[PDB]
Design a protein around this nucleic acid. Structure first.
Ligand SMILES: [Mn+2]
Lengths: 93, 97, 76, 105, 103, 93, 83, 97
DNA sequence: GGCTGTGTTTGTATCAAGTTACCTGAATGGTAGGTGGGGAAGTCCAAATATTCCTAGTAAGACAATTGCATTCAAGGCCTGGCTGGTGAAACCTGTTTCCTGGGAAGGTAGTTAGTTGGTTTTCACCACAGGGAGAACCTGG
DNA sequence: CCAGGTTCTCCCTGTGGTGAAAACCAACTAACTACCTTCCCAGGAAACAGGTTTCACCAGCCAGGCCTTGAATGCAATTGTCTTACTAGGAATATTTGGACTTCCCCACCTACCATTCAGGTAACTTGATACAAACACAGCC
């Protein structure tokens, strides 16, 4: 059939961060499963946060609280900063 | 007269395993909870049952920790717990890395 | 403050676990670990209470934070 | 700007993530900027891991990255090990680590 | 009435609503919630059976959480099901390690 | 407002299994949280089982497999027997 | 074809090399048999789950994703096989 | 000439921590897995990659178990390991069979 | 000081990326629309703060007795290596079984209205257990 | 075995938590309808078990031997145990004050829909990072 993945985006991020570092197929499969794992965790936690307050809509606030819950301190701080910058950049356009 | 050392300790062990009341005094625990809570966010109020829930969780956690610590101490042919036993138990559970 | 956890009180907890004889240096140890155990719970629970834009921690926030830890609590 | 990632200046497909969030039954409905924020989070985490991966890769004079380097970069750090302490990487291995009393004199 | 028609006790309509209002799938077929209600009925019957036995062995007739704690922590399979569970006002089993007791 | 519980059904089951055993309020609250906990576990596992095979309907089969997964051996066997009896009793009526 | 006497397929140098990777120096002679028993218990609480997924979709072949879902349920996530 | 006890173990520790191939031969493990699979249901087929994934997971489980057993044995002032250490580690993990 | 292993470059060859042209289908874009969510004021519920007092738990000081700990020695139980044979492993051909795709029919299940019956709430008597105090007796040091 | 000290049991008094009952009211079921995922049937083929060979690497076995473990021991020292002062928590109670919660009302905003399109999986052609072999320097080990 036609299976969906993330490898091209991993290439783009890798070439933004490193010019001359290759990558095997096994590492690509590991990073693909890694992205699916974190996305599954955050989506499930956001769903329970939306369900707890009798709300019926996922917004950016629930994902911000979920990322503040799951990730440890420094990663949570940097991730909230990055996401806030991205939301402002999208909104001003 | 006097008791031999250790006999009334076993009496106390039977006494406290027999009953199920709270053991840590309430107001020092409540001041400790509010004192820790000041650092993460100021101007916070607590429902009292939430403080009770924290007391229950802390009590159960410490009881399980002392049981596993006792097992580690009995393994090394001693009958007195030591701080390396607590560190060993918290390592094997994987709490501290 | 942290010395509110009292020296003969801790004994009682160790007597519930079935410990016969205790050293002294456990005492300065035991105030540490308990403190760390609060520093993971309350940090989560406050994060719920700011999410609902309220100023009072209710019991269900503590129950949810303990459920995420795995130490599931009944009765409440 | 045609794509939404171009409108936000990111690299992960926001339309794909929005499709998954609608068809993963996580809610009744999805707000606007939520997949944007989520794509930003994923991009930051992926860059943060691949950077230290490439550093550990060039520390052994190799060009490509094999999963041994991912294992060594995850375990040699602290924050990732707190995050990923329940994960077995295929072809992983352990850190080079010997206890103190085992070394002879 | 569905609970009489199945000959059960847990409210089938309530469990059916809670499967609807919980966002678990697109559509919930019938035959599912009666099966689930029977499972919950069996589990509650098992626990109240053992709790009543433990309560009768202490010369009482009401049930306090000490009885529930001693009922769960004696049976093996419920102990393995509920290992991650803290019960309020519970206590532990009377448990003594071997080398503690004197001579 | 008006909160929902299970206490009347617990009374009915208790009087089916024991004539003269009382129950305090605390034990009732514990059993209420217990029922909500097991129902949450089984419903979540059934949802993931329906999602894994690209199916979009929860039936009795998914709950049977979920109960066979979560509960240990003897409890799983007796629970499958009880649920099968209940399904046949409902269907024949 | 009946199958029996395969738990001794795991040999003493294999467990020896496993303990050498963990950082263990001196091994008693009574570890070996005991180790086998632990391994057997572990495989039960994978395979008993895994085939249930295979029993659910009405199949005869246990794929890789079923093992990955079984390990993901047991609390040991595995990467590098999809999912 | 003969090596002393102590050095060969360190050489093997450094080697088998350096390299990351597999350490269990494929065919006896395959016979064992297919045996235990037959014990539940008759006439079951495996993809080979699922057998490889099982071998990877069980190797990881045994390596982690021996690391925690080594810590427990070093705690009791010994160098040799004994099955008391494995039994204690599996009790403290909580997985009690 | 002689025996050994790990590391330092040289060169291949090769299989494993990397690059580029192409065919699909998932993303983008303007417009109703209704609906979920933000604001505003009361009120009533519910945590915070003073007070006192008195009681039961806590802090401290001495004192032995019991447990932890360093030493010492015997023995045994496990490291080491040489060699035989023994089974894993790689490759290749063969049957055949199960899976996936595809089309058609269908029974099951959302969706709306109407009728009603079981699920909550207040108040009311009263009995199972708290309290205690007294006797008895099992328990532990002398 | 004897003295005393804590623990089990029995009986009397009191109570407030609990079972019971009348009234209130939102949820539950029956009936009809569209329609829609799902059950059933057949085939192509990818893959899996089966077998065989030939080799090639490694597991078993047995003897030597030597270092780890373990029991016995003396000695120090830390901790349980008892007693005396004291001090701060438990509880009622009043004050108060900020705050959650709920009733209404108004405004952004996500969904559905449909026409348009480009960037992304797929395959063939091309180069190159590296395992491997092999010889030589250094480090170190006994
Ligand atoms: Mn068999």
């Amino acid at each position: 059939s036609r299976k969906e993945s993330y490898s091209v985006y991993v290439y783009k991020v890798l070439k933004q961060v490193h010019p001359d570092t290759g990558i095997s197929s096994k590492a690509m499969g590991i990073m693909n499963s890694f992205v699916n794992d974190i996305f599954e965790r955050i989506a499930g936690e956001a769903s329970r946060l939306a369900h707890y307050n009798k709300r019926s809509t996922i917004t950016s606030r629930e994902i911000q609280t979920a990322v503040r819950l799951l990730l440890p301190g420094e990663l949570a701080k940097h991730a909230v900063s990055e996401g806030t910058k991205a939301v402002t950049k999208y909104t001003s356009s | 007269h006097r008791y031999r050392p250790g006999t009334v300790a076993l009496r106390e062990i039977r006494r406290y395993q027999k009953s199920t009341e709270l053991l840590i005094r309430k107001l020092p625990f409540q001041r400790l909870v509010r004192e820790i809570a000041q650092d993460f966010k100021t101007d916070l109020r607590f429902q009292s049952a939430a403080i009770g829930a924290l007391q229950e969780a802390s009590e159960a956690y410490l009881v399980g920790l002392f049981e596993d610590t006792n097992l580690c101490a009995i393994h090394a042919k001693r009958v007195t717990i030591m701080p390396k036993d607590i560190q060993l138990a918290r390592r094997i559970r994987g709490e501290r890395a | 403050n942290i010395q509110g956890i009292t020296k003969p009180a801790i004994r009682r907890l160790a007597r519930r676990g079935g410990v016969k004889r205790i050293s002294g240096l456990i005492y300065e140890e035991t105030r540490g670990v308990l403190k760390v155990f609060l520093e993971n719970v309350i940090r989560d629970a406050v994060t719920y209470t700011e999410h609902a834009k309220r100023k009072t921690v209710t019991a269900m926030d503590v129950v949810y934070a303990l459920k995420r830890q795995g130490r599931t609590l009944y009765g409440f | 700007a045609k794509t939404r990632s171009s409108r936000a200046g990111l690299q992960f497909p926001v339309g794909r993530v929005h499709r998954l969030l609608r068809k993963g039954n996580y809610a009744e409905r999805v707000g606007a900027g939520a997949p944007v924020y989520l794509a930003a989070v994923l991009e930051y985490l992926t860059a943060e891991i691949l950077e230290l991966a490439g550093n550990a890769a060039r520390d052994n004079k190799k060009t490509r990255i094999i999963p041994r380097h991912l294992q060594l970069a995850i375990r040699n750090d602290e924050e990732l090990n707190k995050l990923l302490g329940k994960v077995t990487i295929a072809q992983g291995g352990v850190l080079p680590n010997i206890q103190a009393v085992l070394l002879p004199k």
